[model samples]
Target: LSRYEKWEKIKQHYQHWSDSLSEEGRGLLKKLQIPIEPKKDDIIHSLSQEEKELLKRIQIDSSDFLSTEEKEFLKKLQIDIRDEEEKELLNRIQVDSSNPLSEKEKEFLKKLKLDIQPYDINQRLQDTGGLIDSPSINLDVRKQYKRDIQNIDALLHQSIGSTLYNKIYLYENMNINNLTATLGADLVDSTDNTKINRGIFNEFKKNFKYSISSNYMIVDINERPALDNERLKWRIQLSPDTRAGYLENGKLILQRNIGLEIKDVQIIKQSEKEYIRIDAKVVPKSKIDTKIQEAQLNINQEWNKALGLPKYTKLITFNVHNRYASNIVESAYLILNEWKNNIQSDLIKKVTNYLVDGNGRFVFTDITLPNIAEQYTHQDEIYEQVHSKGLYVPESRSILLHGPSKGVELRNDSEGFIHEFGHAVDDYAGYLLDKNQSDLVTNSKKFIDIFKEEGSNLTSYGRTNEAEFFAEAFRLMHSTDHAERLKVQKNAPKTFQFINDQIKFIINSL
Candidate 1:
C-alpha cells in the first residue's frame, strides 16, 4: 500500500467509524461534526461496503431494511468477511512470549506463597504434671512463630521482578496426642515446683493440636488486604481429654485453669472421657484485650508520627479486619513515604502519592458500596461487596475507592492502578489535557494511522478517545497477564512501545 493510498484508506475508515459512533462520542471529535456543503447520498447506499455487510449480518432494526437483507444474503459475495479479518488479527497476537523472571527471583516469589511446617511444632513435645496442659510452655510455640516471621522477612526484602504479591496467608497446624505420663519439674530444671491443690494435682493429659494462621499482606500496589476476615488469626485446638500447659522454671508445667469463655461448647462422653468442642470467635484485640489494644494503638500512631506526616494528610486508609507488625498499612505507608521524598515534580509528586494534586481525602474504609459494584456487572441478585474499586476525579484531583482488597485484585487482574494513575500522569506530565498532550502527540497520530491502515483498535475501550485510549493501552502494557500484554504489543505496536517508554519515565522519576 502506497503512503497516499494508506492515507485515503485511513480517511475512509475514520469517516465510517464516525458514522458508527453514538451521538455523544461523535461530539468529542470536532472533525466528525463538520457538515459537508453538499451532502447528497442515499443513507442506505452511502453506507460503506463493510457497513452494509454488518447490517446484513446483524439484521437492521427497520422492518424493511431486513427485506433487503434477503437480497444481500442471496448475493453472498463476502458474508464472512468480518470473521476473516478477525481471524487474521487473532493469528498475529503472541501470548506469553515475554521473558520469564530470573530463575532465582521466580523461586523466591514462589517460596513466599509456598506452605511449610516446622518440625519444632512436633519435636520434644512434653507435658508437665497438672490437670491443665500448658501448650504455651510445653514446647514454646513462640519460637516457631518467630521462625515463620523471619521467613516472611526474608521474602519481603528478597522481592524482585515484575510479579508482586502481598497480603499472602500462612496456615500452621500441629497434632501431637498423648499426655498420660507427666514428667516432674526436675526433668526440665533442678527446682521442682509441684503443687497439690484440692486433690486436682498435675495429673492431666489426652491429646491436643493448634493452628496459627498468619496473613502476609505484602505492602505493594498489587497485593493488599489479602483476605476479608482477620489479617492474622491463631487458635488452640485441644483434642479429647487434652489440657492446656505453660512454662514455669523454664520447664513445661500443666495448669488446671481450663476455664475459657467461648461462643459455643459441646461435651460428649466417649470411652468414659469427655470429648469437648468449642466454637471460637476471632475478635479485634482492642475490643476484647486492652493491653494488646494499647500497643496496637501506639503502633498505628507511630506510622504517622515517626514519618513526620501531618496529623491530617488525608491518606485514605482501610482495615479489612477493622485491622500489624509487619503491618500491611505500615508497609504501604513506608513505601509511599520513601517514594515521596525523592519525587522531583511537586505536581507529579502530589498526584502520585495520594493520586491527586488538590484537596482530596485518601479514604480507607471497609464499607461495601453495592451501587458502585453493580455498575461493574449486572446481575439479578448482587451479593458481593459493591464498590467501584478505585477511581480518579480528573477535575478535582481526587481519589476514591472501595477497599484495598478490591484495589489489589484490580491491580493483579487488570493493572487498574496504572490506568487510573495514568490519567493523573497525563494531566500533570502531558500539559494538562492540551490538544497536543503526550498521549495525543505520541498515540493520537500513530493509533489513528494504524487503525486506518489495519481497521483495528487496540481495545474496544480505546475507541473512546485519546484519553481513554491512553489509559487502556497504558494498563495493558504494564499488565502481568500475558494475553493482555501480548494483545497490545502485537495489535498496537507503536502505541505499546510509546507507552512503555512513558511508564519507564514514571518509574525512573519515582
Candidate 2:
C-alpha cells in the first residue's frame, strides 16, 4: 500500500521492543529519546473530533515498549505491508466519511494476514557495535551507528506499511557528554588502498559537518545560563527535563570541533569460487569466504587512516557465502532495500564515485545530503559506513550502509529499503540535539506523517529539523518518483488519508 503505513508499523515495533530495557539497557540498545509535552485542554479541544477518534484507534505510547501491556498491544497493533492499503481505505471510510463498511471492504480486511517485522540487526549491531569493539575511528563517526541503523529501518518500516516498530532505547546521551561535547559523525569504508580514489570513498568525510554542527549548538545553549533560561516549548533546545524554550533562528550559537574523518575503511577477501577482481580504480569486492569480523575491520581501518580523528570507530563488515559481487551487494541491501537498480557492480562503483562528500570523517553519497532528485532512492546510504557520536542532537547525518548480497534485497524491494535508509537520515538530521544551530525545528507529527505518505521531494524547509523527519521526507518523495511501477502510493485509501492529513498539518505549520 502506502509507504506511510509501512513506516507506522516499523516505528511501533521499535518502541515496544527497545523501550522495554532499563536506562543502562537502553544505552546498550542504542535508543533515541523524544520528549512529549503534557497535553492541555485547549490543545485537546483544537483536535477535530474525527482526528481525535482516529488517533485513539491507533494512538500508542512510545514508552509502552518497556511495559508488558505494550508487548501484547504491539501484537494487535501489527500490520502486514500487503494489507496497509485496505486498512487505510477502511480507516478513511469509517473515520473521514462516516460510511459503513461495504462488503468488499469487509472481505478485504478479513483476507489480510499479519507477518513478523524484519529488523536490521546489522544496523542495530552497528549502532551498538562500539560497545564491543575498539574505537580507533573518529569519535563522532564511531558513536553514530545506532542512529544510522534507525534511519535505514525507518524507511523499511515505510515499505512494510502496517508492521509496526518501536524506538525503545531512547535517551538524551546522559553518559557520553563528559568527553566529546556529545556529538560526532563519520564513515567506515571496507578498503585499505589509500593510494587510489575509491568509488565515492573520498566523500565519506562529509558526515561530520552533517551531524556535528547541530550538536555544538545544543551543548552551547545548555551551558549558557542566558540562552538556557529562555522558554522554548516549540524549541528543540529545551531539555524535556527543563522548561520549554521559544523558537528563534540560530539562537544557540556555538563553534564546535566538528570531527568529520574516516573511521573504519578496509577490504574483505573473496571466496575461492569468487575471485577478487580488482578494478582500475581499486574498488573493493568481498568473496564468499569473507569473515564478518575481518570485513568489518577492513572498513574500520579505512576511516582511521583517512582522518586523524580521535575516539573509537567500530571494526565491522558484512560477509556472505557466495560470489564476491553478490556478497558486497547483499551487505548494501542489509540496509537500503528501498532502492536498488540491478546494474552491474561496475556501474554502481562509477555512481558511488561521483557524489561522495565529507566533513572530516563523515561521508555523503553525493556532494551534499541526498535529495529526492530523479529516482526514489536512499542512494546516500549505498555501501556506506558511519559512527554514531552526535545522533542525539540536531543536524544529524547517518552513514548509508550496504554491500554485495545487499543488492538482491535491494532489487527485490528497492522502495522499502531505500525508504528505511531515509528514516536513518531523518533520525540523524532531526534527533541529534545539536544539528540545527538555533534548536528551533523538530519533527512535528504532522510533518512526519506527510513524508510517510507523500514519497515526493521535500520542500526546502523539511531539511531543518530533528534528522528523523528528513528520512520521512527522503522516503515518500522518492516513492513518488517511480520510473515504471506505481512505486509507493498504490495502496489502501485510509493509509494514504492519514499521510495526507499529516502533510497538510506540516504545511499549515510552515
Q: In model 2, which runs have C-alpha deviations exceeding 4 angstroms? A: 1-290, 298-417, 420-469, 479-510
Those runs of model 1 whose alpha carbons end farther than 4 Å from true positions after fitting are 1-312, 319-356, 361-364, 369-387, 403-414, 431-468, 480-487, 500-510
lDDT of 1 at 351: 45
Global local distance difference test of model 2: 0.28
Per-residue C-alpha lDDT of model 1 across residues 1-510, encoded as one tens digit per residue: 243453343234234433555544333222211212222233334456755554334321111111121223322322333433654453343342322234443332222211111222111121111111222221344454345334323322222112211112112111111111112111122332121121222111111111111222111111122132111121222222221111111111111112222343334333333223333333232333343234345544654454445654544443222111112233334433433332334433444453323444333222222222212223223221123445555444544443323232232312444565556655554433353533334344554564453234565445545665766776666554568878887887776776665545554554
Query: Which candidate number maximizes lDDT?
Result: 1
- In the range 342-401, model 2's lDDT, one tens digit per residue, is 222332222222112212112211111112111113223311212211111112323332
Give the per-residue Cα lDDT of candidate 2 at 404.
Answer: 15
For candidate 2, give the lDDT of residue 220. Answer: 19
Per-model RMSD to reference: 29.7, 24.2
